[PDB]
Amino acid sequence: MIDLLQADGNALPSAVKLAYSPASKTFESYRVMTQVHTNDATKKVIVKLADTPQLTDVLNSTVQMPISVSWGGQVLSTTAKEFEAAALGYSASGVNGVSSSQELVISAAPKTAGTAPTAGNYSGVVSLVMTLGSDNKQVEKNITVTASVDPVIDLLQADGNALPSAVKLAYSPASKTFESYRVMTQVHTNDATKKVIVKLADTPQLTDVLNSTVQMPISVSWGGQVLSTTAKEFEAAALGYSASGVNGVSSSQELVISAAPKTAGTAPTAGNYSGVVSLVMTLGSDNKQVEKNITVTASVDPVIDLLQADGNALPSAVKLAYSPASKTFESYRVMTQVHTNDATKKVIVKLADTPQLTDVLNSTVQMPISVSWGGQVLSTTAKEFEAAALGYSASGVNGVSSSQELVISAAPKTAGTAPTAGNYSGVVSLVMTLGSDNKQVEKNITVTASVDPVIL
Ligand SMILES: [Mg+2]
Ligand SMILES: [Mg+2]
Ligand SMILES: [Mg+2]
Ligand SMILES: [Mg+2]
């Protein structure tokens, strides 16, 4: 006889799996120590493959990787090598007819060495043929070789970095728009011929972190198509894989994530917003997806303004007229409006310091100042104005209160006789706060007054 067995004495396996690592994109070689078992230990051993072995994709016959076979430190082919008996080590083994250990090595890699294998399930047969002498006593060991390359698909930035897990959309309070996130992307895949199918897992929404019901719709496009929960197809030809490439890296494709108020012509409400763009990319027939989750956020800063009802700033100089006939000051009166983008919050109004009309050249005799707003008297301790009561809906533009009267009347200190004569000055500090929010408007009004004893 001639036989080829494992060095332990077991029969050669009829099957071999070549483990694939997607990290290195290579197959681990099968190695096994063997011995020739012979009738005749002086005869040469002629070793060949019956056919040139290939791994072939079970699904597609044109995709093939060559198998490489070595035995005894010699690479095998359909051309036979003759092993002289002397360096098979027949006396080393301690068993008659039995060689020393010879390594069998079965490897696979792509025909173009240094490139990555295409996705697929691969099979083929290695047919090891061994003879003696001039002979036709001939052993054939057939070893079914298997390998799997699982479909891989990734979406990367065009510098090869991962897409970010979070994105901020900058808000302009002037144009009342959010600036779109835009990034240049490339598909990386080991199955480049397949169509890429692109969906969102759910309809993305920019949602007020503190109110479920307050939403702005997010728009996502990739490669010049607006995406939805309904899948869109990108043919491999349309994705611009270079003919000179096989890393399966697409042409650069732009991803755009946009948001806008649900209704055109309107301002977003103050607050912090978020939702998740769940991008889903499928290889056509391979049943494999990558999901990319990108958290999208936006901040609409709370804003509060107090203006005259005509939209002018309040004055930074008020003068109160004196009648000596009635011995009393005429009040300053002005219609004002609160302009806000958080028109559910309570508005908190107070005075920052307590105002006086101080005498100009001696800083002693002082005529302190009454301030009223919205039909409510003001102190340095605050009055609460509920949002319903400011009547933001009741009037005209959204987020502008109906007209509230600001009344500033001085009538000095102790009551029911004439004030003392003199020229007077001072400063009203007014403070408005959008409640719970961390937002303050200060408005300083310089008050001046005259009593002159040279008139009636
Ligand atoms: Mg834009
Ligand atoms: Mg390349
Ligand atoms: Mg009056
Ligand atoms: Mg009296």
Side-chain angles (χ1 to χ4, degrees), residues 2-151 153-302 304-453 455-456:
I2 191 149
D3 209 337
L4 201 74
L5 300 165
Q6 291 177 63
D8 77 350
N10 210 2
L12 283 182
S14 28
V16 155
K17 197 184 181 178
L18 305 180
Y20 173 79
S21 42
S24 72
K25 298 146 187 226
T26 56
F27 305 100
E28 187 150 1
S29 301
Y30 179 71
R31 291 159 192 283
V32 80
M33 287 312 156
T34 63
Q35 306 171 296
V36 191
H37 288 235
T38 192
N39 214 112
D40 186 20
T42 52
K43 270 180 156 85
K44 66 206 187 115
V45 178
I46 309 114
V47 196
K48 63 156 181 187
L49 313 174
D51 299 81
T52 307
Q54 289 300 321
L55 290 163
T56 297
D57 170 40
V58 174
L59 300 195
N60 198 316
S61 207
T62 58
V63 187
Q64 25 175 237
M65 293 177 290
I67 293 161
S68 208
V69 189
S70 91
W71 187 88
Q74 295 295 315
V75 168
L76 306 182
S77 70
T78 51
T79 301
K81 283 170 188 229
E82 273 93 326
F83 287 80
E84 294 295 329
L88 297 165
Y90 277 118
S91 205
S93 79
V95 199
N96 269 185
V98 190
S99 75
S100 55
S101 281
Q102 310 299 134
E103 205 174 61
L104 174 75
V105 180
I106 297 162
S107 59
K111 194 195 202 217
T112 307
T115 62
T118 301
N121 287 309
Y122 292 95
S123 217
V125 183
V126 172
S127 278
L128 193 48
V129 176
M130 225 167 262
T131 332
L132 291 110
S134 220
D135 278 67
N136 35 30
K137 250 97 254 182
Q138 202 200 275
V139 70
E140 191 167 6
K141 311 309 264 204
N142 317 286
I143 304 155
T144 292
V145 182
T146 288
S148 287
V149 182
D150 286 65
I153 179 140
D154 214 9
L155 193 70
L156 295 171
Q157 295 179 48
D159 62 6
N161 283 178
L163 289 176
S165 68
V167 142
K168 192 193 189 168
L169 320 178
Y171 175 68
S172 160
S175 64
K176 277 120 186 251
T177 51
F178 303 97
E179 179 193 44
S180 303
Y181 173 78
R182 299 185 184 258
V183 74
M184 290 291 192
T185 71
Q186 279 172 321
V187 190
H188 290 230
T189 182
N190 66 358
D191 217 7
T193 38
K194 307 288 157 252
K195 75 191 175 198
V196 175
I197 285 161
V198 191
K199 56 169 181 197
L200 315 165
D202 36 77
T203 308
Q205 288 288 337
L206 215 47
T207 301
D208 188 333
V209 145
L210 302 163
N211 190 337
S212 270
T213 73
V214 177
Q215 287 175 123
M216 296 164 300
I218 288 163
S219 299
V220 196
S221 59
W222 187 84
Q225 284 326 294
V226 190
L227 308 164
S228 98
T229 44
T230 303
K232 263 165 137 168
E233 265 160 69
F234 294 83
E235 315 273 87
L239 283 166
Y241 296 107
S242 346
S244 221
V246 142
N247 270 110
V249 180
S250 77
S251 256
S252 205
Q253 309 294 130
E254 178 137 291
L255 171 70
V256 194
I257 298 159
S258 303
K262 177 126 204 283
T263 159
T266 71
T269 288
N272 303 109
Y273 294 84
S274 70
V276 180
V277 173
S278 287
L279 191 53
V280 190
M281 288 201 171
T282 305
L283 279 164
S285 331
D286 281 15
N287 318 111
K288 167 88 182 173
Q289 71 183 50
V290 67
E291 196 181 58
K292 307 293 312 186
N293 293 313
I294 300 145
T295 300
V296 178
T297 62
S299 247
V300 179
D301 287 358
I304 185 163
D305 269 14
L306 190 62
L307 307 166
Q308 298 191 57
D310 65 8
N312 301 319
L314 307 198
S316 311
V318 153
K319 209 245 202 253
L320 322 158
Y322 180 73
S323 183
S326 53
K327 277 150 203 160
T328 51
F329 296 95
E330 201 207 76
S331 310
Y332 184 59
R333 287 161 179 275
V334 75
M335 290 300 149
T336 59
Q337 294 171 317
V338 188
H339 294 234
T340 183
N341 57 5
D342 218 348
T344 59
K345 305 291 169 150
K346 52 238 265 226
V347 166
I348 289 136
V349 204
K350 65 157 188 94
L351 308 149
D353 24 281
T354 299
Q356 330 281 293
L357 278 148
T358 314
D359 193 91
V360 180
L361 265 98
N362 295 287
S363 179
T364 325
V365 189
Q366 283 187 294
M367 307 166 152
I369 295 152
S370 267
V371 189
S372 184
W373 186 77
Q376 291 289 327
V377 200
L378 290 161
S379 64
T380 198
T381 341
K383 284 216 175 122
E384 294 206 297
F385 286 88
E386 302 289 331
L390 295 190
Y392 285 105
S393 72
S395 264
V397 194
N398 192 79
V400 180
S401 78
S402 79
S403 285
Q404 309 290 123
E405 203 180 20
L406 170 72
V407 187
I408 300 156
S409 33
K413 244 273 125 66
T414 331
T417 29
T420 331
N423 264 64
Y424 286 91
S425 175
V427 278
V428 172
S429 305
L430 204 60
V431 158
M432 278 205 177
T433 295
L434 266 173
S436 76
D437 296 4
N438 218 207
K439 210 68 238 240
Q440 195 132 259
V441 76
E442 209 179 285
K443 233 133 186 255
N444 284 282
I445 306 135
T446 304
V447 188
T448 32
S450 259
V451 187
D452 249 274
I455 91 108
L456 142 134

mmCIF file of all heavy atoms in Angstrom, residues 244-247 249, ligand 2:
data_model
loop_
_atom_site.group_PDB
_atom_site.id
_atom_site.type_symbol
_atom_site.label_atom_id
_atom_site.label_comp_id
_atom_site.label_asym_id
_atom_site.label_seq_id
_atom_site.Cartn_x
_atom_site.Cartn_y
_atom_site.Cartn_z
ATOM 1 N N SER A 244 -10.762 50.938 -11.292
ATOM 2 C CA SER A 244 -9.435 50.694 -10.672
ATOM 3 C C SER A 244 -9.464 50.316 -9.163
ATOM 4 O O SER A 244 -8.469 49.810 -8.628
ATOM 5 C CB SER A 244 -8.513 51.905 -10.888
ATOM 6 O OG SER A 244 -7.181 51.490 -11.204
ATOM 7 N N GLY A 245 -10.579 50.609 -8.488
ATOM 8 C CA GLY A 245 -10.832 50.109 -7.136
ATOM 9 C C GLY A 245 -11.272 48.644 -7.106
ATOM 10 O O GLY A 245 -11.950 48.169 -8.035
ATOM 11 N N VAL A 246 -10.715 47.895 -6.155
ATOM 12 C CA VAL A 246 -11.485 46.951 -5.336
ATOM 13 C C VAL A 246 -11.008 47.076 -3.856
ATOM 14 O O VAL A 246 -10.021 46.452 -3.443
ATOM 15 C CB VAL A 246 -11.563 45.437 -5.999
ATOM 16 C CG1 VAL A 246 -11.484 44.283 -4.959
ATOM 17 C CG2 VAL A 246 -12.851 45.276 -6.854
ATOM 18 N N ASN A 247 -11.497 48.135 -3.213
ATOM 19 C CA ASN A 247 -11.875 48.064 -1.807
ATOM 20 C C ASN A 247 -13.355 48.191 -1.556
ATOM 21 O O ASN A 247 -13.798 48.114 -0.394
ATOM 22 C CB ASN A 247 -11.084 49.063 -0.954
ATOM 23 C CG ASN A 247 -9.815 48.482 -0.433
ATOM 24 O OD1 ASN A 247 -8.727 48.874 -0.864
ATOM 25 N ND2 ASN A 247 -9.933 47.456 0.414
ATOM 26 N N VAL A 249 -15.216 50.889 -2.192
ATOM 27 C CA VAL A 249 -15.423 52.204 -1.588
ATOM 28 C C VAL A 249 -16.121 53.076 -2.618
ATOM 29 O O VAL A 249 -15.576 53.296 -3.718
ATOM 30 C CB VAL A 249 -14.077 52.869 -1.115
ATOM 31 C CG1 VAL A 249 -14.343 54.236 -0.495
ATOM 32 C CG2 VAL A 249 -13.375 52.000 -0.097
HETATM 33 MG MG MG B 2 -9.174 51.753 -3.276
#
